[PDB]
Write a protein that binds this ligand. Structure first.
Ligand code: HEC
Ligand code: HEM
Ligand code: HEM
Ligand code: FES
Lengths: 62, 106, 241, 379, 81, 67, 54, 54
């Protein structure tokens, strides 16, 4: 029998509040770098060819 | 001049009495009363047997309201039984001051 | 009390929540203003800063700008300029003055088109249907000479001579100009003009909503989690009494 | 009190006006507004500041500047709307805080109530000037009459109007003044709040049942803080959604044109909450007598605590009072839409119909209610 | 005065509660809660709606009443004279 | 040339009943006017009525019909 | 803090706000500064406990 | 008025056309100066008796 990651996790991290605090920033960092990167695609997936990002290729540097 | 309508009066009474939820929370009429000065010293003159019992039901009452549960209807208060215990004390405090109030007029 | 018409609700490439504008049509919608509307109605509030929004290359918009401007600049070293230089310059008025405007318009005063969109009721569809709508004066009605009947028009007699016909012009696209196409093209153009932020402002609009559903329950749970002990109370009244 | 870190600056012992301030158990999300109100305001101050940072008040400048704000200023578009739209939210936040007071009879506390009274009167003019600041077509004309309105004083008004004008007209200085007023004014309120609050600490909050809560209390921090946090978070989207996707909805004023004293708008309305008063204003043909009512309209709130008619404070147990209570609710909202109508003949009648009703609801019905009901339970 | 100490006097009450961990955030929140939503909603809706009717009625009532009154000039007086 | 989608979409909806239905009223007005136009009468009021629902139909169609 | 390459307009306007609001802040702070003083009371020129005579 | 073009001419205009625009401006400025020397003494007292002990 092995502990579910929960039983690991508190013992590992959540026990000491500093660590418990520490991780918070850590993932939050990697979070946003990935997070915003996803929605924009979804966003620009929704709007195709309405944006220079798609449009401007028609005339961009001639 | 009312006799049969007097009998007819009580239905809406009983009806209106049943149209206010505190009947369905196990309260009574007296503990409903808004406070006042006469209310205050009236409290003093109560024996605990009521007084404590007055307390608990209130305390009981509040909790339920927290959780949005109404008392099971079987246990609701009954229009046949209303305890007036407050007022026989109340008239004293009302009375006496009316004198002072008046006897100090002139 | 001319019966106040409404321009019917048209769908739009941007009409939907997350729906955005096409700049290509905007490229056109400029041209007509560049061609026509500069007649009377100006827009004072716009620089040549457009560049990438309507996709214009800076050089383009620059060269596009630099054609436009050109006024004096040599008055005893006190100036302005010919030939704009930068693109921060706004767009020259046809008129020096409300006087020169109004008299030339014969008592008519052409409004600014910069913000004109969000001003009038009925959205851009107003103008679209307005430029659409022109009808022959019903039986027993007369007009001023400049005034032309239009049902949308509040007085329903408008001094504006209807500009648009099928293929008034050619488009920078070169799509054959159509009185309808011509109309619809500019409609987006102004509509965007009053809201340059628009197609962007939905980004976080999207972005916030994705974020948004996360927090609410968590609190509500923790809320309940704290409150859990509260709503779990049990009373016991056991007076020894 | 040994080594308590909350003693060392005594200031922290004033802090225990919160964390140990006890509260009754049962409290509805109805009560979350007092919190929000202060919070809705904090944001105001800030945003209402940064505006000024790029803002200029001048007859020639202000509009073009404000034009320039959403144009060249970083996020000049979010901010302006954060200010305006955020204003609107403060209202509906506020009224509920009122509505709670009535519907349970929390007004029973006399002074605390009164402070709220004054506190209310203050807030309106703020927005009022705040609304003139745009110097839009309406803002010019809107205040133009509303100020000209006050001329109905039989005698001293004539000078006094032009005085507050500082002129024969709406001209420049009349602008500039407001800016100062509209600028300083919130700080005053914030002070007053600390008074309004203060008495409340004396007697504590009330409970929905309209009953003495003495027996059961709660340490404030672990709990109501949270429900507020969520409650606070409730507000976010409420503005966020409106402010972001569809700006112009409650941005109902359509006037971005420069204020024209020559041109007059065919339709003249303030914004919404300003209307329902202005609706009553439209009603009376008599100029003076009308204004008299408009004044009397609100102030009767302070009168209401004279109207405690029964032996039970809250309305949750009085159906009829509750029946009455909800009845009045509509009468207002009608006027709102009524004031949102041109003055054609049904409306004309309608307002006249709904107007006298309003007070009549208050001034006659509500007191007699408990009187019967007091007698009903045989109390 | 001192807030928690001296408020009331109470005797022979007993109270029981658990660690919040010991229990669940949603003990049948869905199933068991939905009835409680329903039962009490009617106690209000009795006394809530009736006016809201009235306005909307009058709202449209006047609306129509407004319309034809205005809308049609050659309504009662038609354009023979 | 191009004839536009409009004029086409103009006709498709005016084809609908209430269109021609009230279009009669226009003439019901108009013809009576034609004799009586001395008096204030004008069919404009009805024209808008005529055109109102008319283009309410024309609404959805041509915006697709356009580019 | 300029908001620019120079002293230009906005650099003015900012200050106005700052210079405008700022005293109110002080006035608040005063009520703090005072407050502690009530705790221990003022001192006397002799630099001596004044307790006996008030 | 705070504006790059306006402010000076306005302030010019103040002592010109404004009722008592001359007393007031100086009341503001000169009154500022007085606040200083008022203030320093309040400091100086603190030191010279060591009131800073608080
Ligand atoms: C004839 C010169 C001229 C032409 C060319 C011209 N405008 Fe018009 N426009 C006017 C005048 C003059 C008015 C006002 C006439 C009146 O009020 O009866 C007007 C009306 C308008 C209105 C509506 C005014 C209002 O009250 O809302 C707009 C918008 C407008 N013009 C913009 C445009 C647009 C868009 C175009 C291209 C289709 C254009 N102008 C081309 C002169 C012109
Ligand atoms: C209770 C808080 C406030 C109220 C009721 C209020 C009222 C208003 C209103 C209604 C507007 C119109 C918004 C708009 O037209 O977009 C406004 C704008 C403005 N307010 Fe306030 N405001 C508040 C906070 C503040 C504060 C604290 C300040 C000063 C620091 C301030 C300064 C301004 C400015 C500069 C504007 C210009 C934007 C404009 O008028 O459009 N506001 N104010
Ligand atoms: C900006 C306006 C206001 C603010 C910021 C404000 C703020 C608050 C706050 C934070 C509370 C404590 C929360 C609570 O007791 O529920 C409160 C309580 C109260 N306020 Fe105000 N309030 C405002 C307006 C008013 C007005 C206009 C009135 C009445 C005329 C009023 C009357 C009361 C009353 C009666 C209470 C106590 C209610 C109770 O304890 O049951 N408030 N207010
Ligand atoms: S006085 Fe101008 S409308 Fe009443």
């Amino acid at each position: 029998v092995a502990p579910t990651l929960t039983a690991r996790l508190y013992s590992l991290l959540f026990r000491r509040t500093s660590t418990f605090a520490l991780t918070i920033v850590v993932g939050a960092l990697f979070f946003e770098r990935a997070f915003d990167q996803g929605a924009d695609a979804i966003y620009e997936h929704i709007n195709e060819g309405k944006l220079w990002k798609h449009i401007k290729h028609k005339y961009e540097n001639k | 001049a009312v006799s049969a309508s007097s009998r007819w009066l009580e239905g809406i009474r009983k009806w209106y009495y049943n149209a206010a939820g505190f009947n369905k929370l196990g309260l009574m009429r007296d503990d409903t009363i808004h406070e006042n000065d006469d209310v205050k010293e009236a409290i003093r003159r109560l024996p605990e047997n009521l007084y404590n019992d007055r307390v608990f039901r209130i305390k009981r009452a509040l909790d339920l309201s927290m959780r949005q549960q109404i008392l099971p209807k079987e246990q609701w208060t009954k229009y046949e039984e209303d305890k007036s215990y407050l007022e026989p004390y109340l008239k004293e405090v009302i009375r006496e001051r009316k004198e002072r109030e008046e006897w100090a007029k002139k | 009390s001319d019966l106040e018409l409404h321009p019917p609700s048209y769908p739009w490439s941007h009409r939907g929540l997350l729906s955005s504008l096409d700049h290509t049509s905007i490229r056109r919608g400029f041209q007509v203003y560049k061609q026509v509307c500069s007649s009377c109605h100006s827009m004072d509030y716009v620089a040549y800063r457009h560049l990438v929004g309507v996709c214009y290359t800076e050089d383009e918009a620059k060269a596009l700008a630099e054609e436009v401007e050109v006024q004096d600049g040599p008055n005893e070293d006190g100036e302005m300029f010919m030939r704009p230089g930068k693109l921060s310059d706004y767009f020259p008025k046809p008129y020096p003055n409300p006087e020169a405007a109004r008299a030339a318009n014969n008592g008519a005063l052409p409004p600014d088109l910069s913000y004109i969109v969000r001003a009038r009721h009925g959205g851009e569809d107003y103008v679209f249907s307005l430029l659409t709508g022109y009808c022959e004066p019903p039986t027993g009605v007369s007009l001023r000479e400049g005034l032309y009947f239009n049902p949308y028009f509040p007085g329903q007699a408008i001094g504006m001579a209807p500009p648009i016909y099928n293929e008034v012009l050619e488009f920078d696209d070169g799509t054959p100009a159509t009185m309808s196409q011509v109309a619809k093209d500019v409609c987006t153009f102004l509509r965007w003009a009053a809201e340059p932020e628009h197609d962007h402002r939905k980004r976080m609009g999207l972005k916030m909503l994705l974020m948004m559903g996360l927090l609410l329950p968590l609190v509500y749970a923790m809320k309940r989690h704290k409150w859990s002990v509260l709503k779990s109370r049990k009373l016991a009244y056991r007076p020894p009494k | 009190m040994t080594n308590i870190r909350k003693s060392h600056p005594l200031m922290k012992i004033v802090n225990n006006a919160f964390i140990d301030l006890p509260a009754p158990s049962n409290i509805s999300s109805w009560w979350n507004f007092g919190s929000l109100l202060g919070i809705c305001l904090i944001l105001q101050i800030l945003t209402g500041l940064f505006l000024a940072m790029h803002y200029t008040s001048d007859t020639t400048t202000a509009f073009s500047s404000v034009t320039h704000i959403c144009r060249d200023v970083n996020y000049g578009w979010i901010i302006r709307y954060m200010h305006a739209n955020g204003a609107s939210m403060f209202f509906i936040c506020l009224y509920m805080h009122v509505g709670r007071g009535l519907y349970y009879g929390s007004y029973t506390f006399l002074e605390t109530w009164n402070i709220g009274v004054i506190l209310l009167l203050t807030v309106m003019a703020t927005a009022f000037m705040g609304y003139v600041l745009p110097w839009g077509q309406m803002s010019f004309w809107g205040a133009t009459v509303i100020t000209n309105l006050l001329s109905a004083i039989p005698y001293i008004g004539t000078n006094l109007v032009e005085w507050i004008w500082g002129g024969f007209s709406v001209d420049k200085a009349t602008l500039t003044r407001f800016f100062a007023f509209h600028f300083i004014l919130p700080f005053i309120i914030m002070a007053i709040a600390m008074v309004h609050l203060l008495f409340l600490h004396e007697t504590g909050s009330n409970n929905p049942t309209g009953i003495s809560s003495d027996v059961d209390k709660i340490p404030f921090h672990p709990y109501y803080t949270i429900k507020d946090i969520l409650g606070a978070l409730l507000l976010i989207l409420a503005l966020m959604l409106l402010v972001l996707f569809a700006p112009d909805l409650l941005g109902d004023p359509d006037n971005y044109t420069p204020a024209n004293p020559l041109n007059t708008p065919p339709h003249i309305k303030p914004e919404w909450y300003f209307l329902f008063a202005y609706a009553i204003l439209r009603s009376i043909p008599n100029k003076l007598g009308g204004v008299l009512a408009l004044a009397f309209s609100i102030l009767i709130l302070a009168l209401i605590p004279l109207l405690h008619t029964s032996k039970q404070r809250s309305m949750m147990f009085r159906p009829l009072s509750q029946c009455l209570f909800w009845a009045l609710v509509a009468d207002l909202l009608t006027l709102t839409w009524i004031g949102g109508q041109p003055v054609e003949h049904p409306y004309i009648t309608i307002g006249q119909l709904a107007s006298v009703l309003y007070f009549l609801l208050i001034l006659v019905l509500m007191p007699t209610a408990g009187t019967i009901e007091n007698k009903l339970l045989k109390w | 005065g001192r807030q928690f100490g001296h408020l009331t006097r109470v005797r022979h009450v007993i109270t029981y509660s658990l660690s919040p961990f010991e229990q669940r955030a949603f003990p049948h929140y869905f199933s068991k809660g939905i009835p409680n939503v329903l039962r009490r909603t009617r106690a209000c809706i009795l006394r809530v709606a009736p006016p809201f009717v009235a306005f909307y009625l009058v709202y449209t009532w006047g609306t129509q009443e407004f319309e034809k009154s205005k809308r049609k000039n050659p309504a009662a007086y038609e354009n023979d004279r | 040339e191009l004839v536009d989608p409009l004029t086409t979409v103009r006709e498709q909806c005016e084809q609908l009943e209430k269109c021609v239905k009230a279009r009669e009223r226009l003439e019901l007005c108009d013809e009576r006017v034609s004799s009586r136009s001395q008096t204030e009468e004008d069919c404009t009021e009805e024209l808008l009525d005529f055109l109102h629902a008319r283009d309410h139909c024309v609404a959805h169609k041509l915006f697709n019909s356009l580019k």
